[PDB]
Symmetry: D2
Subunit: 95 residues, 4 copies
């Protein structure tokens, strides 16, 4: 089961998502919403294993046709890539 | 010990490298020469684990300050990347 | 939409799955069935990016709670790992 | 050029390595010594891209026939792997 935080709810109401009382979870765009932290943990984990760029994971994700609406996906995705030091090194290569 | 093929020798003489009789191996640019197949096997192996692009591995390599002159490096490097289907998929995500 | 082959249907009927006429796809264990080739292409693609072992991807997959029943998953998963030369090299390391 | 710290020198003298005045660097086992932090940064970077286990990187390294003696290699290598959360997750899949 999904567990949401105040921040999550704040972003969700601000996003225009609905909370399904009987269902235990929020919905947006006809999908169950994946919380921010869950989304981050997942995305971080994916980047660690592939170290794919922002543009690349994003396209791969949208193509993955996820059952879940990943809250703050792109924002979190950027943070992860932009702060990945491994990615930073493999791209700091000018002579 | 390094083992060279006819093709290797053909490219080496064409490259202007010298063969060190007493040393058992060819030299180019003051480095022992890494044969073509050895170079390929190595590079392929590296690409499989990182799936880094051509431009990226190349820069990483030149920065690695290898003890060996990798025969037909760039040519082989291109082939590997250009024919990597995993790389092909992660980049076929265009709209 | 999913496209199935004779082989797929042969394994599916042999598996005890049902084909949903109106739905266009086979179902097994309450999930839409992912064809063999689709499953393979996907799994191969995952292994290429992580090169995780059999035991590891399997557990990761079962934990992923997939919406789809991946046809011939374990059999295909084994083949991929057992024939991955990169995995073969990183593990051929005895002195 | 290599830059060494007090800690490095402390471990180096304790290791029995010599410092080559004219050469600017310490030597151990006939190799130029790679400082601790440099070794760590390098090893961390390698683990990020492959997430190979301790036993695996170690064997791969020894097989790499490095020109440099990597200071505190195994100790640092362990720390990196043992504290890698990605590795922790991919292996926390136990039942
Ligand atoms: Zn990265
Ligand atoms: Zn690739
Ligand atoms: Zn593999
Ligand atoms: Zn790791």
């Amino acid at each position: 089961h999904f567990h949401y935080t105040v921040t999550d709810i704040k972003d969700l109401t601000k996003l225009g998502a609905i909370y399904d009382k009987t269902k235990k979870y929020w919905v947006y765009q006809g999908k169950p919403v994946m919380p921010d932290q869950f989304t981050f943990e997942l995305l971080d984990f994916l980047h660690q294993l592939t170290h794919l760029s922002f543009s690349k994971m994003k396209a791969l994700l949208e193509r993955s046709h996820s059952p879940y609406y990943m809250l703050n996906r792109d924002r979190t995705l950027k943070n992860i890539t932009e702060t990945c030091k491994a990615c930073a090194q493999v791209n700091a290569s000018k002579s």
